[PDB]
Structure 1
Amino acid sequence: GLTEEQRMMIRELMDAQMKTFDTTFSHFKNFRLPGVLAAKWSQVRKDLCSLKVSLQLRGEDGSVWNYKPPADSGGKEIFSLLPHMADMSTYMFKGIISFAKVISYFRDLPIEDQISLLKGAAFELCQLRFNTVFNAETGTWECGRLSYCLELLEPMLKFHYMLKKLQLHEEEYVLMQAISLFSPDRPGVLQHRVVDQLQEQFAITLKSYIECNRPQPAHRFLFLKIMAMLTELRSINAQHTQRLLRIQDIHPFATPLMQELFGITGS
């Protein structure tokens, strides 16, 4: 029941996802790992209290490495996972950038808007991709041979847990990535009218997809719930951006690609 234009729209989105999302994380290599063996700091202490996650490393030979993070005791041990998380966020950013650069609607935009759209949404599309590998039963993000296990009040798990409950299709996840990518009200966007029109289509296609393929009573209002997530994911964008900048101020860790996406000039 989709138009032919809507059908081709989903197929290009699925095609970009197919090409730029390494669901097995096979090419995530050479990453750093935790070492072996004033009112600011008190806020960064509270900030880093969500990164406390254990880390599992299953080798091809069958060996397994597990890391259990320390407990906060007023020192620098609270930064032990920052170098590794930065490498993973960077690998995730490269794939998100590759995702956008394949989409025709994205390439046709001016280069200054392409940069602005990526800067404003890169983190959101990363969270949407992580949710597809999130295991809500074990509280673990199964990233191929890597596993991030947790040691709902903290908004970005409430997001991940709720989004998994809706139990979406691959087509619905990638349509969400497009709506969040093509947000016309990011800082610095100039073709606001052109990007808003594109964003609308993506949203109307997602609405039509749900109504043609999901008649069950459990999926009543499903389109409106997704749009609520995206608004909620945008809020979690920005409150995590703040959190990032605060940790970076006292304890630098952001990679060059991260600095570029978060406006850090390096000076």
Structure 2
Amino acid sequence: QGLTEEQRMMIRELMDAQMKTFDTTFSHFKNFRLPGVEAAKWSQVRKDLCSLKVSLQLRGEDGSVWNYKPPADSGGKEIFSLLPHMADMSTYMFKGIISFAKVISYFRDLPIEDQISLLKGAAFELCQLRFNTVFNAETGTWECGRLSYCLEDFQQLLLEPMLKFHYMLKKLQLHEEEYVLMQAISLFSPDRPGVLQHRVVDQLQEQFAITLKSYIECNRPQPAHRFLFLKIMAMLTELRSINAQHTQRLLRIQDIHPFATPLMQELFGITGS
């Protein structure tokens, strides 16, 4: 609508990249693992697992249904039973994220070193933003095509920052264009560890944020959307904080129960030695 030509083409490129690289039905997610058929650090692991307490459902192509109810925490390794499957899901999402960045002209024009630093910095955030678009806030369920992930037991759930983020972001009822602009702004973060072209990346980020702000002003006159751009920017700031918290959760769990795939090791800085 009422944007500059540069702004409209910028949204069209982002929407084009999202359409090409986001398997919204998860049809190509296959071959994943499923759950099978000194102690002050350990209770920290119970805390480090809170955002992933889900049951799992598989609807088969034939119409069959498999449900998995996880074990209760009985003090043993059984809290790790879903981690292999989660690693396969996240890895699959991360490939989508990487493909998304590679399609964007503004991203492929950066030096490959900064491309790698930016993806290392933002992969978790873009993953969570994509998961929010399949999140059902009425049933607390991420609806991933034939897979469903439903939160286990009520409002003590919203004490987990990750889960409060998904419910709050869902409440804003964003358009597809606003989600993919959130992804652009998070991807082009000039202050990630190891970025060299600080100013180029920072100017790109500002252009994406200006586009987002202008999109909202032109297509959202309603008083419910007053300050909407500022709410989004505050959520992106919270999400970067959640990203730092969860990066540390992963490294702690990896330290005592290895599970990260090779791609997760690259993205989160695990060298293998």
> Shorter-chain TM-score category?
over 0.9
Tell me the percent identity: 100
1:109 shift after superposition: 0.1
Q: Given the two structures, how large is their TM-score scaled by the length of structure 2?
A: 0.97
Aligned positions, number? 267
Question: Residues of 2 paired with 1:109 and 1:149: CA distance?
Answer: 39
Q: Unpaired runs of 5+ in structure 1? A: none
- Secondary structure of 1:142 counterpart: strand
1:37 shift after superposition: 29
Q: 2:189 aligns with which of 180, 183, 187?
A: 183
- Secondary structure of 2:67 counterpart: strand
Question: Residues of 2 paired with 1:20 and 1:169: CA distance?
Answer: 18
Question: Residues of 2 paired with 1:49 and 1:10: CA distance?
Answer: 35
Question: Residues of 1 paired with 2:51 and 2:98: CA distance?
Answer: 26
- Secondary structure of 2:55 counterpart: strand
Residue number in structure 2 paired with 1:59: 60
1:52 shift after superposition: 1.6
Distance of aligned partners of 1:37 and 1:124 in 2 relative to their CA distance in 1, 3 Å threshold: closer
- Secondary structure of 2:50 counterpart: coil
Question: Residues of 2 paired with 1:32 and 1:200: CA distance?
Answer: 41
Distance of aligned partners of 1:228 and 1:248 in 2 relative to their CA distance in 1, 3 Å threshold: same
1:49 shift after superposition: 2.9
Question: Residues of 2 paired with 1:107 and 1:167: CA distance?
Answer: 30
Per-residue deviation, residues 171-193 of structure 1 (Å, max 9, x unmatched) = 00000000000000000000000
1:38 shift after superposition: 2.6
Q: 1:221 aligns with which of 195, 207, 227?
A: 227
Q: Bigger CA drift: 187-196 or 42-51?
A: 42-51
Question: Residues of 1 paired with 2:235 and 2:143: CA distance?
Answer: 22
CA contact (8 A) 2:50 2:160 kept: no
CA contact (8 A) 2:117 2:195 kept: yes
- Secondary structure of 1:215 counterpart: coil
1:164 shift after superposition: 0.5
- Secondary structure of 2:159 counterpart: coil
Structure 1 residue 235 and structure 2 residue 241: aligned?
A: yes
CA contact (8 A) 2:26 2:146 kept: yes
Q: Unpaired runs of 5+ in structure 2? A: 153-157
- Secondary structure of 2:214 counterpart: helix
Root mean square deviation, CA, Å: 1.8
1:60 shift after superposition: 1.0
Q: Given the two structures, how large is their TM-score scaled by the length of structure 1?
A: 0.99
